[PDB]
Write a new protein. Structure first.
Length: 98
């Protein structure tokens, strides 16, 4: 069953990619510190907050995630608000502070 794709040749991976091609977001740990996070594929705020959950050993119901200054759902995505690559997220102690 002859497929051309497996025999088309021209295989390889050239450096057709730049460092700032992807996305970058800083989730300012709410203590006067800010850790650089990064987005590679289309990945909404969900993984940005969960990797943070796993990072501090405390999940997102215990860290209110505000981005562009305003808390919201992770499924809202960055560009949907108008702010993207170079943006920041702030996680405060729980949703109601307690």
């Amino acid at each position: 069953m002859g497929d051309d794709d497996s025999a088309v040749n021209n295989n390889g991976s050239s450096p057709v990619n730049n460092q700032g091609e992807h996305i970058q977001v800083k989730v300012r740990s709410p203590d006067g510190a800010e850790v650089f996070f990064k987005i590679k594929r289309k990945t909404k705020l969900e993984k940005l907050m969960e990797v943070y959950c796993n990072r501090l050993g405390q999940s997102m119901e215990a860290v209110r995630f505000l981005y562009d200054g305003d808390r919201i759902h992770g499924d809202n995505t960055p560009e949907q608000l108008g702010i993207e690559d170079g943006d920041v997220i702030d996680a405060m102690v729980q949703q109601t502070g307690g």
